Amino acid sequence: SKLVMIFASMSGNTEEMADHIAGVIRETENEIEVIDIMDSPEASILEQYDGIILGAYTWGDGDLPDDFLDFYDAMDSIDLTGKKAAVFGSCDSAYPKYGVAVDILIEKLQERGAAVVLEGLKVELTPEDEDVEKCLQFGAEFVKHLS
Numbered sequence: 001s002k003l004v005m006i007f008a009s010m011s012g013n014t015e016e017m018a019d020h021i022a023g024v025i026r027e028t029e030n031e032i033e034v035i036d037i038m039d040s041p042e043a044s045i046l047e048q049y050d051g052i053i054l055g056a057y058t059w060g061d062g063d064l065p066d067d068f069l070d071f072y073d074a075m076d077s078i079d080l081t082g083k084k085a086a087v088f089g090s091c092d093s094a095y096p097k098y099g100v101a102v103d104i105l106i107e108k109l110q111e112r113g114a115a116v117v118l119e120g121l122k123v124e125l126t127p128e129d130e131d132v133e134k135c136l137q138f139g140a141e142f143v144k145h146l147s
């Protein structure tokens with residue numbers, strides 16, 4: 001199957017999660033294209049993949065990264081029925097609205113018809129060894145849901 005991952009990372013933590021999730025997935029007989037939101041992918045490309053993984057940190061007042069906002073709006077015009085999807089992000093518990101960018105992206109994927117096959121994965125700030133193992137398990141479980 002063909003997979004796409006779109007992530008956002010300002011201080012590298014969500015990037016580290018993306019690289020380890022995609023690196024695990026890459027060891028299967030599936031292709032995965034990993035794209036940084038700062039390269040401005042158009043949301044219509046999501047329609048062209050069998051599975052979709054989004055990664056995002058949370059920004060001010062429980063919001064999406066600023067660089068995700070145009071893409072998020074463009075998701076209202078895409079059809080994801082049938083696709084398998086999942087979301088992860090780095091987070092900070094000094095904020096009350098903890099990791100809610102993950103929950104916002106999950107909700108939009110649901111609205112467009114994707115089958116969200118994993119709970120959202122939230123890691124506090126920089127992954128530690130246990131967090132990297134969670135990233136491994138996330139990629140492993142995602143692949144199990146494909147066909």
Ligand SMILES: Cc1cc2nc3c(=O)[nH]c(=O)nc-3n(C[C@H](O)[C@H](O)[C@H](O)COP(=O)(O)O)c2cc1C
Pocket residue numbers: 008009010011012013014015057058059060061062063090091092093095096097098099100124125126
């Ligand atoms: C201005 C600012 C606002 C933030 N707001 C939240 C928030 O509401 N909730 C949250 O969980 N983290 C929030 N954070 C924390 C970032 O999500 C956190 O530092 C994360 O590790 C960044 O991921 P990154 O390294 O991929 O950029 C915010 C951080 C900054 C600097």
Ligand SMILES: OC[C@H]1O[C@H](O)[C@H](O)[C@@H](O)[C@@H]1O
Pocket residue numbers: 076077078
């Ligand atoms: O792409 C726009 C339209 O796509 C689908 O039909 C959605 O279910 C509908 O709510 C939306 O208005």
